[PDB]
Design a protein around this ligand. Sequence first.
Ligand code: PKG
Length: 284
Amino acid sequence: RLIYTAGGYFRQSLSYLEAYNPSDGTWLRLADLQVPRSGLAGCVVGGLLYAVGGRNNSPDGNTDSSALDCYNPMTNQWSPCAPMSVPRNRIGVGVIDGHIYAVGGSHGCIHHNSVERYEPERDEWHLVAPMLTRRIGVGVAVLNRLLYAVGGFDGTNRLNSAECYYPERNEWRMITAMNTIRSGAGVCVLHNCIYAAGGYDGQDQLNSVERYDVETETWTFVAPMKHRRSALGITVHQGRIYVLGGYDGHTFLDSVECYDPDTDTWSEVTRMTSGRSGVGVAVT
Ligand SMILES: CCn1nnc2c(C)c([C@@H](CC(=O)O)c3ccc4c(c3)CN(C(=O)c3ccccc3)CC4)ccc21
């Protein structure tokens, strides 16, 4: 399985789709997105890569995207799907039982607290219960068939709070807040724990990383990354966390760090073909 990185931003929204093979250390250049996208989120359902939301910030215009596009690795083709009810720039995405949940995001200056769910076998979006907080740049993690939305930006303050969505009950419940305010951080699930890495606390870009244990209801710092990163791509591949690119306050990073939970260590493993931030990343 490969680590796919779709879109991104560097002076403008990008159309790149590249894939990393963690065993051979090789990079693949695949079919470009039809529309350049930054601030999107990626996910995989049924071996198909999906690109949700974001926007195309160009030197000629700026349009937030309600689009859903699905890349087929066997055909190397992007195909458009049913758009969402609203444009969702800086979106969070999670997958439960084959359904793509789209969390928060912004449309111009409107910061969403609404959530919609996509059925791939019917090409249809449907609104579910809205979150208790408006969140853009929110991280999303699926654990125990529950959906966790972590941090983000509510329109006035960057958030350290987090809430949990219960699909069978269609309700949100606030959980323990993190130790650090994080917007545009990398949120993933590794070994029954929710990891949150990097982000932006309103003043600086962070290198700190904390993980949440569902049963202790406590956030715990772990070893920090070698680079400060915000708006980074994150995913899990064979028991290790990979973070890609991001913004460090000066440069757009091309570094790719790898976190091993057994030794609690971050190690640079590769570099992308160019620096970028706000990418959509998924594994298939
Ligand atoms: C500049 C200070 N700075 N440094 N870090 C910042 C972050 C994370 C944000 C948030 C918004 C906010 O928290 O109000 C935010 C969250 C998600 C996305 C973007 C921005 C825009 N994203 C970009 O590609 C991008 C481009 C350039 C720089 C950073 C990110 C992708 C998606 C804003 C401001 C921040």
